[PDB]
Amino acid sequence: AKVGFIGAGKIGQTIAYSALVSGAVDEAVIYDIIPELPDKFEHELRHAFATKGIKANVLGTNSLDDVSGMDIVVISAGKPRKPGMSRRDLFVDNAKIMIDLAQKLPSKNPGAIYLMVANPVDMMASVFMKYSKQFTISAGDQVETMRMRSFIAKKLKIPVTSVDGFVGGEHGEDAVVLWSTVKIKGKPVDEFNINKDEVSDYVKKIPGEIIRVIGGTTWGPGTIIADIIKSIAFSENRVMSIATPKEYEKEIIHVSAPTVVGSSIGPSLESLLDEKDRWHLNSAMKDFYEAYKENLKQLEQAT
Amino acid sequence: AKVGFIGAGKIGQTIAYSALVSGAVDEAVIYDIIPELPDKFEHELRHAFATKGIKANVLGTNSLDDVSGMDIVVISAGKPRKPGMSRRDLFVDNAKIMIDLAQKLPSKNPGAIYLMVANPVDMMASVFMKYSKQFTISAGDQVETMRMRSFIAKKLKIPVTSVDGFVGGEHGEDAVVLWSTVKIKGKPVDEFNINKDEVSDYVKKIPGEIIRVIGGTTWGPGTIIADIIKSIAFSENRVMSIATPKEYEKEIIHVSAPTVVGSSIGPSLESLLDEKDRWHLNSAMKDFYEAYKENLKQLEQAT
Amino acid sequence: AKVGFIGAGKIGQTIAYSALVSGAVDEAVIYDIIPELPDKFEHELRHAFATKGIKANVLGTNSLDDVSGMDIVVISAGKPRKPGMSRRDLFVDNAKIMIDLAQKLPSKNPGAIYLMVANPVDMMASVFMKYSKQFTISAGDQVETMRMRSFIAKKLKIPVTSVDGFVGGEHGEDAVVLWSTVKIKGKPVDEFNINKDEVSDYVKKIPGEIIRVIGGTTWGPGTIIADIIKSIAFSENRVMSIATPKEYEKEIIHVSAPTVVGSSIGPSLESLLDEKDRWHLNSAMKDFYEAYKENLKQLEQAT
Amino acid sequence: AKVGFIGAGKIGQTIAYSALVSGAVDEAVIYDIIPELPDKFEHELRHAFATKGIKANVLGTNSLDDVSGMDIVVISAGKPRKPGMSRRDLFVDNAKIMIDLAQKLPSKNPGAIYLMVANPVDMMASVFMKYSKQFTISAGDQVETMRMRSFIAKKLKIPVTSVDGFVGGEHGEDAVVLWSTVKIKGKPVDEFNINKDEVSDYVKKIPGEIIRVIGGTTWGPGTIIADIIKSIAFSENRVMSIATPKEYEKEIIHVSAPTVVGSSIGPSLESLLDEKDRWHLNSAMKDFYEAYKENLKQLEQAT
Ligand SMILES: NC(=O)c1ccc[n+]([C@@H]2O[C@H](COP(=O)([O-])OP(=O)(O)OC[C@H]3O[C@@H](n4cnc5c(N)ncnc54)[C@H](O)[C@@H]3O)[C@@H](O)[C@H]2O)c1
Ligand SMILES: NC(=O)c1ccc[n+]([C@@H]2O[C@H](COP(=O)([O-])OP(=O)(O)OC[C@H]3O[C@@H](n4cnc5c(N)ncnc54)[C@H](O)[C@@H]3O)[C@@H](O)[C@H]2O)c1
């Protein structure tokens, strides 16, 4: 696929690098508002490519117009979290970015899939889609999903490959582990020595903890989001707990649920969850819709 | 994963080779009735591994008791089709193989996923599961699925990665394209100039044509079935049109539908298809049922 | 790289499949004299590609004029060995193939690297280069090299990645282990309990044993030769004991020594071997020379 | 291989991640003096591994004693460059680190290969080896080597895979392009529209420029150094322009030259360079020896 990267900070570089070395990206165009940053990143990539024999076309640029004719456009441009902040605290800052980008990108990338990475991720995806009128998805709870699998595997001292399942609903701190999907070698997680609250808590806290020590999350979400790109680019049909757009009281919202990710996106698999999980996903919709409306008014308090 | 390969003929060797070089198999045990065959294949694999730096343990054996402790057991032991034959002609001869394997493998590989390759594939899976009571899947129409995708791509002169969709129902000559799933860059196949009947006919005829010219199918189903193994081994959650066990009229039958394939298998997604494709999948259940009951009688009439 | 495959039998198909799934081949054109064979192999490859997201162009053809513009041309067209035969028995029959290919391929593929696989491999490379004057290499003793490594590893019950070293000189039954290059975790092989003669004998006999049981060698040399292709295609600079053209007594001959393989081929490293291994490589030149002159006379005595 | 990482800053993380995802590292132990940093990096890795199905054992730790029984030990612990500094300016700061590590690591990792990454790289490798008495190599001019190939490919608008060759001698700013190795599709670089001084200059300046804009080099040298790890771990025998130890006036020094990198290291290929290149490598030895002796005295001016 041809993939545009809007944002070449820590997470944008990690995602682009990981997606490029995985072989899923035939051509990439990497943009950033910071002078020379994308350009120097391009050189980094070429140097890396030489050792691997990678021939992917890469352009690092400060010119937004170079992001044209892409299949997928990955948006990580935004303020990141500082210790002590919630993700939703960023709404007003980063929504202005999305509003601006929504004016500019569409005419150059008609029919592209837009992949939101910038936080608060689900909200950003809704804002971007509202303004751009372009099909937009959010990395959503796919990162949470993998964090959950890896914690459970570490806890039982089993390979992560023995664990299956997803995290879903609202993003981050408000996500829910979808326990009816969670299986260990095919068996319900109940059959195991697993404290469900300890799993949820690790998932919600570990990014905050990475931020406090390292300064931001990189390798994990970078790899994970790149795999979303790869599933689209190779048409692999991986079920991923991304957030796809839904209509709710005539407003576009984004909420996560296991979703088939291929050259085409969908369907989402919420209808196949157990009752409790389906109730949590309905709930997540109502809560998201309420918090997002509030946030839109508070932004409308521009003047 | 630890993977058992039962049957080391053309397709068995291809699946094993491809699953091993893909990185999805940590240990493999390969069995065949043919004296020394498994041994010499093992030496072939070792030679290949040396150039790749692959360290997977591999044992080729003529003693079936050496296949123990597997996570996945792949069965390709059986007589293949000859130009002229139908897949289902093989039922009696190959059912006898499955009944015997079902009395030997499970005690050594309890709780393994059993992946049926030998034809008639779906019926063999049903027999094996009947005589073993171990969880058994069939390659099903996943091969057809890929043939369909590839045909549409070469026809429209587009990358295969632009095409999404599945083939399902009964296996082989009785399969149906699930047209409500076939999309080109997200758009319904009707918006393109492809003749649905030409697609079907290609899918149905190409294996018979390859069998006529080359003598048997290898690289295609081998790679495609190795990817089923990989999706289980790495818990990738790819939607694949494999055939999983379904309770119908109190019998266990196998029919293909798009199904989540990870360390855990399922759910199948037939409830998300359109009315027409759900009708077709319901008829396939009925038809498979009637034909399997008939075939079972034929088997009794041998023994 | 753009890669031409001349001969789509057992080994040709294996090399091509393995080189294509490794990512080293951007475009491939596969030729065989057998009507429809290349075509049906192409369809096999396309089916495999769909599951992997591989977009390499591939053309199977019965018209040799379709092989043009290649960077590398791989020749496996020829009669194979039967239980009992020696590799060199094939000289006359296969030399006739090479003389013809040499009058047809170069005009269409000027400046390509020609990689000889058909046996007797080294002698075929010398003939092809004689009649084509195009730069021609032979798989040489790279296959032997890997067999030797793998044997030592299984013997000492160590990972194959712990073993380094090469097999060189004449090909096959006349090859010699270059013992000054064989190291286990950096240490000379003498410090371990391996019998040098048992290693040699294994290396010499295993292909004949595989040919006896299975009918021909495939996965091992196929993977190993595909890695020669990859090392050229990605300019990896792997030292491989291939046979490159050497001017001796004003003839061009082919003998194996560890050689740098990248987008450019060479140098060969025989001047860095110990006295004994340099002696052996000098005798192989003399012996190959005398035997090739004899074989050329035999060819004249056919035509 | 089992690989220890001493240092989990920007370059240590990039190298470890790249080496891990490439599949060359079976077990890694990552240490850093910064509290909690390695630990949080380990979590990042596990999260990334979950999406890929990677089962490599990883331990991120603040306890140096955990770095035991490794095959390879990769040392990136040290002060990095700030704009305006040369690499050799760091000698006195980072040599103290190496002296300390030389007391501590050996008894826990007997017979390991130590891979120096921290600057001034060649000097650091000599210091570490002097004090530890352990076999030590330096990433050397391998990074420069790839930078050169990629620049030339960009300049001629050809794939980097068409370019072959190496940079060698002293490190960084004092490196020399070894023009007799440099080939484009097999042809001498003279046959091409290439300004040699412009190539050298780009190579020497581009890291300084990345540092000024981004803050440090990451992806390129990370990938490149990881490929050195991979060549050792898979015993691939890639020729790489690393710096291996040589004796000079009874002192151990490190200088770069194309070197065969496998489970065993060596031989270096300086003897096969043209005259001019060989003279530059002799020269580099004399100059290195002089600057390193000076630096050792200036450090001995501890008191
Ligand atoms: N799982 C996830 O979804 C996930 C993971 C990691 C980070 N993030 C989020 O991604 C965003 C970026 O994080 P980061 O660590 O890379 O931050 P960072 O500060 O390293 O980078 C942000 C980048 O965005 C750029 N930027 C800001 N405004 C821009 C504009 N108008 N146009 C173009 N570029 C612009 C900056 O120049 C900078 O290079 C943050 O919102 C962070 O919270 C999300
Ligand atoms: N897409 C698919 O599902 C697919 C693709 C290719 C082949 N097949 C089927 O796979 C089967 C094998 O095809 P093939 O081309 O490899 O045939 P083959 O003759 O090359 O190999 C069959 C192997 O099974 C062995 N065998 C027979 N009975 C056995 C037993 N009781 N235990 C162990 N091994 C036994 C034979 O010894 C032989 O080595 C056939 O039924 C064929 O129709 C299915």
Ligand SMILES: NC(=O)c1ccc[n+]([C@@H]2O[C@H](COP(=O)([O-])OP(=O)(O)OC[C@H]3O[C@@H](n4cnc5c(N)ncnc54)[C@H](O)[C@@H]3O)[C@@H](O)[C@H]2O)c1
């Ligand atoms: N390590 C090695 O170097 C190695 C390994 C395996 C096989 N081989 C050699 O490779 C050759 C092929 O072995 P195989 O097992 O694939 O034999 P095979 O009979 O399976 O295949 C040979 C193919 O070459 C074709 N052929 C014959 N003449 C031709 C021509 N003029 N143009 C195009 N195609 C032509 C045949 O039609 C057939 O499809 C043999 O000489 C064998 O000894 C070498």
Ligand SMILES: NC(=O)c1ccc[n+]([C@@H]2O[C@H](COP(=O)([O-])OP(=O)(O)OC[C@H]3O[C@@H](n4cnc5c(N)ncnc54)[C@H](O)[C@@H]3O)[C@@H](O)[C@H]2O)c1
């Ligand atoms: N091609 C190359 O060889 C290459 C490429 C990039 C960077 N580097 C060099 O590598 C070194 C590290 O660079 P970076 O960008 O990762 O710097 P950085 O500041 O991001 O990280 C340096 C790390 O070393 C750690 N450290 C310092 N002293 C230590 C000790 N005594 N024990 C353990 N850990 C210690 C720090 O805690 C820090 O995390 C520098 O010398 C830099 O110049 C070399």
